[PDB]
Structure 1
Amino acid sequence: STGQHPARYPGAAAGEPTLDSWQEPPHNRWAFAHLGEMVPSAAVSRRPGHALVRLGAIAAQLPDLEQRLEQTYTDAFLVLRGTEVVAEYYRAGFAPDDRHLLMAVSKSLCGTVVGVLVDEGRIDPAQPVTEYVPELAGSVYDGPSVLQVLDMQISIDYNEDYVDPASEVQTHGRSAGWSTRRHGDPADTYEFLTTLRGDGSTGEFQYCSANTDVLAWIVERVTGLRYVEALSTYLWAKLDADRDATITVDTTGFGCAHGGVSCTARDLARVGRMMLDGGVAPRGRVVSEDWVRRVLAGGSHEAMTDKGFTNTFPDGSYTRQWWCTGNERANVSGIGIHGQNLWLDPLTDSVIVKLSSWPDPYTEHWHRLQNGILLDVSRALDAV
């Protein structure tokens, strides 16, 4: 068993409703107001073919930028310098206020929610995961600290290969409802997480999407809120965002913390703005100055042995669900496959959002091009 989880609605039985029960009482009072959480659904637009190009005062320094964005399958691109939007691009067919899947940029949002609860003293990063989720006893998460989950420093038998059909990340996806279930698959994400094993070693970076969903599980046990609600209460609702975000949910209503958030480019930039404002958002403080400082400082360099990342960023690292380049600008970024970045450039007090759809989840080729653009744009923002 995976223990207590936040009910889908007040008074709901465990795991209710399902796809087969949402029409029945008492579930239907909730379900009729939230049907998209149960059944795939399309928007019917209240509004009645060409790219929107407003690259502003970086266009002069980067004359070929639009072509570079097209070449990296850019859907939305936005540069926020201070509080001002100084450059924007949206491909034909993608509206400025359309939402876009964040993939693992989602992780950086989850880490932020954890940070809030650390500030409140409700989570102690030094404590074992099992202090908050006892039911992970006997799994690879039995022993490691919450900080080691935050920093992805746990050795896990989990192949995070995004193309291999046999990998654990595929099984993770089926458990999350991202793909069709196979016979024998875990019922939900919680169950899937309890199946994970490892050799027991910690301290070396291993990127694993399971870690983030463990963090969200911790958030749920500490707050009693569905992760979907926690993400709103502790982060999204404080941003004064233009639109709601969305997040995929599995059959229990558990939001896919590791990869399933969608939002507008402009609203994602508000998260970066909060980070560069020492953790304060328009409607109140989100996380502490100390938490932000620790994110910007980076993780242990020794732990970071991922040659892909370090080939580009020799002094790079990872902490608290953020990638830290350790470059001369000390850039830090949320990163998702197929070209998603929430990129922070503290030197110029700027945030760059790039949301894309590369044909491949991740290759050195796309990595090189994507980071080349983000660095060139950052530098174009420097005083001259």
Structure 2
Amino acid sequence: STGQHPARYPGAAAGEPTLDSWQEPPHNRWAFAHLGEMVPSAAVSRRPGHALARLGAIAAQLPDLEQRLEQTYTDAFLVLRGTEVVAEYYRAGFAPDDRHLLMSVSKSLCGTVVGALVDEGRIDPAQPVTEYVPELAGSVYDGPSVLQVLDMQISIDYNEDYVDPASEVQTHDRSAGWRTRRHGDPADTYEFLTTLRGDGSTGEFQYCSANTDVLAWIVERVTGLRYVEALSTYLWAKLDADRDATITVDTTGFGFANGGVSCTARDLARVGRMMLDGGVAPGGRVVSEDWVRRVLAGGSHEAMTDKGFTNTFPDGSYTRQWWCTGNERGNVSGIGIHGQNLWLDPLTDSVIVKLSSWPDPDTEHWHRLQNGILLDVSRALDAV
């Protein structure tokens, strides 16, 4: 058993409704107002083919920028300097106000919700995961602290060989509804997390999406809110965003915290703006000044042994669901597969959002090109 979870609506039984019960009372009152949470759905546009390039002033310093964005399969690109949008690009077929999947940039948003609860004193990172989710006893998450989950410093037997259906990475997707279920699969994301094991060692960075979903589970047990609602209450609703975000949900309504958020490029930039404003957003403080400082400061360098990161950023690290380059500019970024970045350039008080669809999730080739663009754009913002 995985214990108590937030009801889908007031008074709802555990796990209700399902795809097979949403038309029945009392579920249908909620379901008729939220059917997209149950059944895949398409937008029917209220509005009745060419790329939009407004690269502004940086165009002079980067003459080939649009071509470089095309080459890295850029869907949406936006540069926010201070409070001003100083450059934008959107591919043909993608509107400025269209939403885009964030993949693991979603993790940085989840970490922010955790940080909000730390600021309120409702989560103590020094406490073991099991203080908040006792049901994770007996798993790899029995022993580690919440901070070790935040910094991803837990050794976990988590096969990343996606093509193999036996792999933890594909099983995670199937448990959450991102892929077709196979017989015997865990019923939901919570159950999948409880199946995870490790040798018990901690302290070395291991990037693992399961960690973020454990964070979301902790958020739910602490607040009593669905992660979907907590993500709004503690972050999204304070941003003065143009549009709602969306997040995929599994069969229990649990948001896929590690990777399933979609939003507009301009709205994602508001998250970066909040980080560069010491944790404060238009709707109020989101996280503490200290939390932001710790993110910008980085994690333990010795923990970071991922050569896919350190080959480019030798002094890099990871903390609280953010990648920290440790470069001379102090750049920090949310990163998601296929070319998603929420990139912070504190030196110029700027945020760069790049949302993409590389044909491949993660190769040295694509990262070299993408990081070259982000760094060139960052430097183009320097006073001269």
TM-score, reference length from structure 2: 0.99
Q: For residues 176-206 of structure 1, give each alpha carbon's deviation from its aligned partner in whole angstroms, at most 9, with x where no partner exists.
A: 0000000000000000000000000000000
Q: What is the CA–CA distance in structure 1 between the aligned matches of 2:103 and 2:366, rounded to whole Å?
A: 16
Q: What is the CA–CA distance in structure 2 between the aligned matches of 1:279 and 1:164, rounded to whole Å?
A: 41
User: What secondary structure is seen at the aligned counterpart in 1 of 2:115?
Assistant: helix
* Contact kept? 1:72, 1:370, Cα under 8 Å: yes
Q: What is the CA–CA distance in structure 2 between the aligned matches of 1:26 and 1:206, rounded to whole Å?
A: 44
* Contact kept? 1:162, 1:361, Cα under 8 Å: no
Q: For residues 20-69 of structure 1, give each alpha carbon's deviation from its aligned partner in whole angstroms, at most 9, with x where no partner exists.
A: 00000000000000000000000000001100000000000000000000
CA positional deviation for 1:167: 2.0
Superposed CA RMSD in Å reads 0.6
Q: What is the CA–CA distance in structure 2 between the aligned matches of 1:159 and 1:148, rounded to whole Å?
A: 20
Q: Residue 233 of structure 1 corresponds to which residue in structure 2?
A: 233
Q: What is the CA–CA distance in structure 2 between the aligned matches of 1:161 and 1:243, rounded to whole Å?
A: 36
User: What secondary structure is seen at the aligned counterpart in 1 of 2:57?
Assistant: helix
Aligned length: 384
Q: What is the CA–CA distance in structure 2 between the aligned matches of 1:60 and 1:240, rounded to whole Å?
A: 32
CA positional deviation for 1:146: 0.1
CA positional deviation for 1:165: 4.2
Q: For residues 258-299 of structure 1, give each alpha carbon's deviation from its aligned partner in whole angstroms, at most 9, with x where no partner exists.
A: 000000000000000000000000110000000000000000
What does 1:350-369 correspond to in 2, within 5 Å? 350-369=350-369
CA positional deviation for 1:162: 4.4
CA positional deviation for 1:160: 2.8
* Contact kept? 1:102, 1:260, Cα under 8 Å: yes
Q: Residue 246 of structure 1 corresponds to which residue in structure 2?
A: 246
* Contact kept? 1:323, 1:333, Cα under 8 Å: yes
CA positional deviation for 1:164: 4.6
Q: Residue 307 of structure 1 corresponds to which residue in structure 2?
A: 307
* Contact kept? 1:339, 1:358, Cα under 8 Å: yes
Q: What is the CA–CA distance in structure 2 between the aligned matches of 1:23 and 1:324, rounded to whole Å?
A: 47
Q: For residues 126-154 of structure 1, give each alpha carbon's deviation from its aligned partner in whole angstroms, at most 9, with x where no partner exists.
A: 00000000000000000000000000000
Q: What is the CA–CA distance in structure 1 between the aligned matches of 2:63 and 2:165, rounded to whole Å?
A: 41
* Contact kept? 1:348, 1:381, Cα under 8 Å: yes
CA positional deviation for 1:171: 0.3
User: What secondary structure is seen at the aligned counterpart in 2 of 1:255?
Assistant: coil
Q: What is the CA–CA distance in structure 2 between the aligned matches of 1:21 and 1:57, rounded to whole Å?
A: 55
Q: What is the CA–CA distance in structure 2 between the aligned matches of 1:160 and 1:104, rounded to whole Å?
A: 15
CA positional deviation for 1:247: 0.0
The answer to which of 142-151 and 157-166 deviates more is 157-166
Q: Residue 55 of structure 1 corresponds to which residue in structure 2?
A: 55
Q: What is the CA–CA distance in structure 1 between the aligned matches of 2:239 and 2:164, rounded to whole Å?
A: 37
| Closer/same/farther in 2, CA of residues 361 and 258 from structure 1, 3 Å limit | same
Q: What is the CA–CA distance in structure 1 between the aligned matches of 2:163 and 2:70, rounded to whole Å?
A: 23
CA positional deviation for 1:307: 0.8
CA positional deviation for 1:166: 3.7
CA positional deviation for 1:79: 0.1
User: What secondary structure is seen at the aligned counterpart in 2 of 1:56?
Assistant: coil
The answer to which of 166-175 and 71-80 deviates more is 166-175
What does 1:321-340 correspond to in 2, within 5 Å? 321-340=321-340
| Closer/same/farther in 2, CA of residues 55 and 97 from structure 1, 3 Å limit | same
Q: For residues 94-134 of structure 1, give each alpha carbon's deviation from its aligned partner in whole angstroms, at most 9, with x where no partner exists.
A: 00000000000000000000000011110000000000000
CA positional deviation for 1:324: 0.2
| Closer/same/farther in 2, CA of residues 215 and 171 from structure 1, 3 Å limit | same
| Closer/same/farther in 2, CA of residues 318 and 186 from structure 1, 3 Å limit | same
What does 1:64-213 correspond to in 2, within 5 Å? 64-213=64-213
Q: What is the CA–CA distance in structure 1 between the aligned matches of 2:165 and 2:305, rounded to whole Å?
A: 25
* Contact kept? 1:81, 1:348, Cα under 8 Å: yes
The answer to which of 356-365 and 157-166 deviates more is 157-166
Q: What is the CA–CA distance in structure 2 between the aligned matches of 1:27 and 1:340, rounded to whole Å?
A: 37
| Closer/same/farther in 2, CA of residues 159 and 291 from structure 1, 3 Å limit | same
Q: What is the CA–CA distance in structure 2 between the aligned matches of 1:92 and 1:2, rounded to whole Å?
A: 45
Q: What is the CA–CA distance in structure 2 between the aligned matches of 1:265 and 1:105, rounded to whole Å?
A: 12
User: What secondary structure is seen at the aligned counterpart in 2 of 1:369?
Assistant: helix
* Contact kept? 1:337, 1:362, Cα under 8 Å: yes
Q: What is the CA–CA distance in structure 2 between the aligned matches of 1:165 and 1:56, rounded to whole Å?
A: 46
* Contact kept? 1:58, 1:380, Cα under 8 Å: yes
* Contact kept? 1:16, 1:252, Cα under 8 Å: yes
| Closer/same/farther in 2, CA of residues 163 and 88 from structure 1, 3 Å limit | farther
Q: What is the CA–CA distance in structure 1 between the aligned matches of 2:308 and 2:294, rounded to whole Å?
A: 23
Q: What is the CA–CA distance in structure 2 between the aligned matches of 1:249 and 1:189, rounded to whole Å?
A: 10
Tell me the percent identity: 97
Q: What is the CA–CA distance in structure 2 between the aligned matches of 1:162 and 1:371, rounded to whole Å?
A: 25
CA positional deviation for 1:92: 0.1
What does 1:233-312 correspond to in 2, within 5 Å? 233-312=233-312
Structure 1 residue runs without a partner (length 5+): none
User: What secondary structure is seen at the aligned counterpart in 1 of 2:61?
Assistant: coil
* Contact kept? 1:154, 1:202, Cα under 8 Å: yes
CA positional deviation for 1:159: 1.8
User: What secondary structure is seen at the aligned counterpart in 2 of 1:212?
Assistant: helix
Q: What is the CA–CA distance in structure 2 between the aligned matches of 1:292 and 1:320, rounded to whole Å?
A: 10
Q: What is the CA–CA distance in structure 2 between the aligned matches of 1:138 and 1:219, rounded to whole Å?
A: 20
User: What secondary structure is seen at the aligned counterpart in 2 of 1:60?
Assistant: helix
Q: What is the CA–CA distance in structure 2 between the aligned matches of 1:364 and 1:166, rounded to whole Å?
A: 26
* Contact kept? 1:318, 1:324, Cα under 8 Å: yes
User: What secondary structure is seen at the aligned counterpart in 2 of 1:149?
Assistant: helix
CA positional deviation for 1:161: 3.8
